[PDB]
Every structure is written in structure tokens, then in C-alpha cells.
Amino acid sequence: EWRNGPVEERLEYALVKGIEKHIIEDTEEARLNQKKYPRPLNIIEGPLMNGMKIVGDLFGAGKMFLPQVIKSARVMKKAVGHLIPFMEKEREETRVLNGTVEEEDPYQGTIVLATVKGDVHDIGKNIVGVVLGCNNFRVIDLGVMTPCDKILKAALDHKADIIGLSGLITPSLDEMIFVAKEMERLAIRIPLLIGGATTSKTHTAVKIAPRYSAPVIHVLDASKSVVVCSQLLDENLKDEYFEEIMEEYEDIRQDHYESLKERRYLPLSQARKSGFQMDWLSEPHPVKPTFIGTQVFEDYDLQKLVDYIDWKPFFDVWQLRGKYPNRGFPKIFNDKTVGGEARKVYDDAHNMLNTLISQKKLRARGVVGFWPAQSIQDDIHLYAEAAVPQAAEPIATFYGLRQQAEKDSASTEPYYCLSDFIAPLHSGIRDYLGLFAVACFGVEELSKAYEDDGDDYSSIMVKALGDRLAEAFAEELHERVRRELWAYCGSEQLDVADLRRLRYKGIRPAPGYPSQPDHTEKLTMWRLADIEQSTGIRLTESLAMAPASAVSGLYFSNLKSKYFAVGKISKDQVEDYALRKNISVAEVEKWLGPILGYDTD
Numbered sequence: 001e002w003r004n005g006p007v008e009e010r011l012e013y014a015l016v017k018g019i020e021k022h023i024i025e026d027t028e029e030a031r032l033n034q035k036k037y038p039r040p041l042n043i044i045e046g047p048l049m050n051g052m053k054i055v056g057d058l059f060g061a062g063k064m065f066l067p068q069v070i071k072s073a074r075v076m077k078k079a080v081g082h083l084i085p086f087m088e089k090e091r092e093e094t095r096v097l098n099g100t101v102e103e104e105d106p107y108q109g110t111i112v113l114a115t116v117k118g119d120v121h122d123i124g125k126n127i128v129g130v131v132l133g134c135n136n137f138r139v140i141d142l143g144v145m146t147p148c149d150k151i152l153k154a155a156l157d158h159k160a161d162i163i164g165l166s167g168l169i170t171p172s173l174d175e176m177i178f179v180a181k182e183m184e185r186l187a188i189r190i191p192l193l194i195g196g197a198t199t200s201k202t203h204t205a206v207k208i209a210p211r212y213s214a215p216v217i218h219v220l221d222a223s224k225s226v227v228v229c230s231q232l233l234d235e236n237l238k239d240e241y242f243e244e245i246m247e248e249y250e251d252i253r254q255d256h257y258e259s260l261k262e263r264r265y266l267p268l269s270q271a272r273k274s275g276f277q278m279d280w281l282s283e284p285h286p287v288k289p290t291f292i293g294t295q296v297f298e299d300y301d302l303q304k305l306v307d308y309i310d311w312k313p314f315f316d317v318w319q320l321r322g323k324y325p326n327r328g329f330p331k332i333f334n335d336k337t338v339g340g341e342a343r344k345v346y347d348d349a350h351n352m353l354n355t356l357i358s359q360k361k362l363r364a365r366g367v368v369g370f371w372p373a374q375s376i377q378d379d380i381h382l383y384a385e386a387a388v389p390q391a392a393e394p395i396a397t398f399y400g401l402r403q404q405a406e407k408d409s410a411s412t413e414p415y416y417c418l419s420d421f422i423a424p425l426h427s428g429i430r431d432y433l434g435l436f437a438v439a440c441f442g443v444e445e446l447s448k449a450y451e452d453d454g455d456d457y458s459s460i461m462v463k464a465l466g467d468r469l470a471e472a473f474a475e476e477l478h479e480r481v482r483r484e485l486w487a488y489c490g491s492e493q494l495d496v497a498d499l500r501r502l503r504y505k506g507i508r509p510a511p512g513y514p515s516q517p518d519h520t521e522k523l524t525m526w527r528l529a530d531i532e533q534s535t536g537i538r539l540t541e542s543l544a545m546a547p548a549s550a551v552s553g554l555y556f557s558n559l560k561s562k563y564f565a566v567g568k569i570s571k572d573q574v575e576d577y578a579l580r581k582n583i584s585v586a587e588v589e590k591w592l593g594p595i596l597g598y599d600t601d
């Protein structure tokens, strides 16, 4: 039907509908029309950028969703990959004629995207770097583990017009303020973009924007990048936008400083006197684990993990969200707005997952452990199996945090801590604590192989599938522990439908989570369980677990254990925690940055 149209219309239709079936043949038919395009630069600047501008406009208007944008980007990448020989020939002809290759750039501007030495969320940065290509923007993508000095150096040598940082978590955003300070003290006026769809403007306008004398714009999604980045390149709005409405940082500073008086805190001694007390003499006695030490999983069955995968986080990668009550998997498939695209991505993911779990291209790996645990106030101590806890000495210590923000008198909720879920040493009751770590190996190779091919769609899909497999492995390993390896919940008859609702007994608070935001617990876990040497899950210098598709955490078997948020803490708890950990106050003040209840500046 659409094949009957002219070659320009065929190019536009292929770009908009994401069809690679005839892109090369249509491109050839277009270039053989030499009179219509005297320069091989003209063919891209004409029908090709026209369709991509249409795609970007539709994405910004919300009529086209992310996977179709990715497919359109793939079609344009195929067309450009076919056309590169002719672009290079034209550039060589220009060098022959005018003497040198000119600084002509078909893209509107160059953008450097970087991910800090920390947070490993790579999918969003890649989506941005390819949608800006759909927005006709040249993107220099530095990936994960990019040093700040490397970020600045790449911005300088490549003469980047914009530096884009990536952020998707609350902790470890102190590298963004660090690079902002480095950039400010280097005295460069290049505009800056911040974070992703977890970062509120509070952290931006408190520790970033009043810290740099250049435009610092925060964007929610790359759909609005068409407006946002152009307004940083449109000289009519470049000189005015960056300060006309970014003045609202003034509200963010003054109003929140005024609201700081609303926040109230208890003394740490008073908070301890109001902790989560419980009668261990009437509580059921802890169940002894089946073994003490570490049991290693070397070739875990990927086929089994598929039954435990939850897909709503996976659809959140594609930004597919429905209206209430038809929101989330599996109700997402029936919504008229996103049903077809959700079906497409789900079937593609399942097809590639079936291919991978049958070709053994991936390999799950993990380890679990169990040790006897006794709690000294706000701390957890671990002993050997044969040792007597009251007379021997601990082999590993995990330090917890207690809630300190004052609660309204209408609520009687205790000020929670992790140590409240393990029997105290003086009580005479022996308790046990567990830990685990899982990973999925091979995602960082398949993603790179797909990217070198040019199929960013498959790369993003395989990254999301690796993340899903890692979380499913963590959930399944927790399920085995509660019933087989520890057997403190053997009477349970629940399935994955209730596992997704956190209705099981016990909790697995990962280090760095609001339950205990100190990421240094992973160091003690790795030292105790020999995880790095056994399983192969490395720890980054920022305590990020490699490969990125990895999950780790402790095991608490107490019946009354529940997830909680520490909130905000005062300097009293900071110094107490520092003296318990036998480390300087400066280290604690930087590891617990997000949860500090006072401003040091």
C-alpha cells in the first residue's frame, strides 16, 4: 500500500512506522536521484530529519510511546549506516576541493551523557542518548563508571555544548554536586542537565543550582527534550529561560529553610528508651538454620527463575502506564492507549528470554549464609557455630540506625531499628541472622553486542531482562531460605502471587535502603561470606555490586520484623554511630548524607 508512494514518502513512512524491511532499497532509490540531492548531505537533511522531527514531535505530544521511538531510531540508524560510505566520500571530496574537512554538523548540537562513579542505572541514559538522536542531537555516551575528571575532559576535548548527568536513586547523588563544584571552579558556562525520574528539584536547588553560575536545568523525560535542549540552543530563549523561571530555586531554598523549624527530633537516649521493645520470653524461640557457613550456587537454573519474574518494573522501563484501575501488569495489556505496545514489548522480552535460557548465554550465580546472631543495643554481632555467644567474641558486626525524627503524639509507633528484630545478648536467647547475594552474568556482553549491531531496542530489552532475572533469583532464593534452608516458615503454602505482595514472614533489608542507608554493610557482608571470591560479584569503589544485575541483603527471621524508613537523624546519632563503628565523623556524615537532619553548610 505505502510502497506505491514516492521515495521521500517511503522514507518518511519507514521512519515513522519503524519498518526496516525496505529502508536500504528506498535509500538507494533516493541517492540514485542525484539531481534531487546534489550533496549526499542533502538526503539526510531532507526526508530523513523530517521523519525524525515528526517522530520527536509525536513523542513530545504523547501520541507515540518510547518503544516505537526506539524502533524509529533503529530504522534511521540502519539508513545512516547504509549512507556512511557516501558521507565519507562527500567529506573527502570537500577536503580535496576546499582543502580541509569543514566543521559541518548535521546534528543541531553535541551532548555528552555521563553516569557518575556510583549509581549504575544505564538504561535511562541510553534511552536519552538515542531519543536525542530522534531529536536530531549528537550524543557522546560515556556509560557507567565515568570519572568526574573524565567527564570534564571529554566535555572539553569534544567541545560538548551540554553535559548530562544521570541519577535514579536518592543515595550517591553527592557525586553530582561534586562534579558541579568541579565545573564551577573550572569556570565554564556550559549548560547542565540533571538526573532522571527519581530526582526531585529539592536536591538540585539546594546543593547543585546555587552552586554553579551556569544554566542548570532539570528535565523529567526526553520527550520534552525537544523543547528543553532547543531552548538552550535558541539564542532568543537561551539568555532568558535559564534564569526567568529557575528563580523558583529561591522558593525551594527559603520555603524549605522556613519549614526546617517544623522538623523536630528526640534525644538519642530518649529514642532508645522508646525503641521497639518486645518480650522474648513469650516470643517463639528462633529456629536454628540447617547449616552455618556459606552454600554456593554455581549453575542455577535460569528456566526456574522465569516463574518468579514481576513485570511491572519492566514495563516501567518502557514508560508504559495505564489509567486507574487498569494500571500495571497484567491490566496494562487491556488498556486501549498502551495495550498494543505493552503486548509487543512483553512478547519480545519473552522470546529473547526463551532464546537465552535455552542457549545458556546467561548464567545465574549466588551464595547464601547463616550465622548465630546476638544484638547489643543498636548493633548486631555474629559468632561462630561452636562458640558460646555470651562468653566468646563476635566475628562480624552490623551496626543499625534508630529513627530520631519526632512523631506526632497521635501515633504510638516505636522508633524502629534493625537490632530490635534480634534477641539481645543478655536475654539468654540465641538468635541467628542470614545474608545472600545473587547476580546474572553475561548481560554486559549481550547488551554490548546488540549495541555494536545497532539494535538499541534489543540492548535495552536484554538489560531489563537481566535485571528481572536478578530480582527473580533474589526472590526465589528468599523463598527457599524461608522454607528449606532455614525452615522457620515451612508451613507456608503461598505462591508467587503472594510473594509479589510481601506477605511472607521475615524481611530481607538490603544495605543502602531506607531501612539502613549505610552502604558500608556490603563490605562486612562480602568479607564474612567471601562473596567476591566465591560467586564473582565485585564491589565497586562506591560499593555498587558488579554486574549491575545483582541483588544482595541480609535475612531477618523475626516474626514481627517489618520494613521501616530511618528518616532524618541528628548529629548526636551521627557521632554515636561513628564511635560505635570506630570511624571518623566525616565518613559517617558523607555515607548518611541523604538522611542527615541538619545542614552543615
Ligand code: B12
Residues within 6 Å of the ligand: 113, 114, 120, 121, 122, 123, 124, 125, 127, 128, 163, 164, 165, 166, 167, 168, 169, 170, 171, 193, 194, 195, 196, 197, 198, 219, 220, 221, 222, 223, 313, 314, 316, 317, 318, 319, 463, 464, 467, 510, 511, 512, 513, 514, 544, 545, 546, 547, 548, 549, 550, 551, 552
Ligand atoms: C531496572 C532498574 C534497575 C537496574 C538499572 C538498569 C541497568 N542498567 O541495569 C539495576 C539492575 C542496575 C537496578 C539496581 C538497583 N536499583 Co534499581 N530499579 C530499576 C527499576 C526496576 C525500573 C525503573 C527503570 O529502569 N526505569 C527506566 C529508567 C532506567 O529510565 P528513566 O529514568 O525512565 O529515564 C528517563 C528519565 O528519568 C530521564 N533521564 C534519566 N536519566 C537521564 C540522564 C539525562 C542526562 C537526561 C537529560 C535525562 C535522563 O529521561 C529518560 C527518558 O525516559 C526501578 C523500579 C521502579 N520503581 O520503577 C528500580 C529503582 C529505580 N531502583 C532502585 C534501587 C534502590 C536500586 C539499587 C540501589 C538496589 C540495591 N542494590 O541497593 C540497585 C543498584 C545497585 C546494584 N548493584 O544493583 C530504586 C530507587 C529508589 C531509592 N531507594 O533510591 C527503584 C525506584 C526501586 C524501588 N522501588 O525502590 N535497578
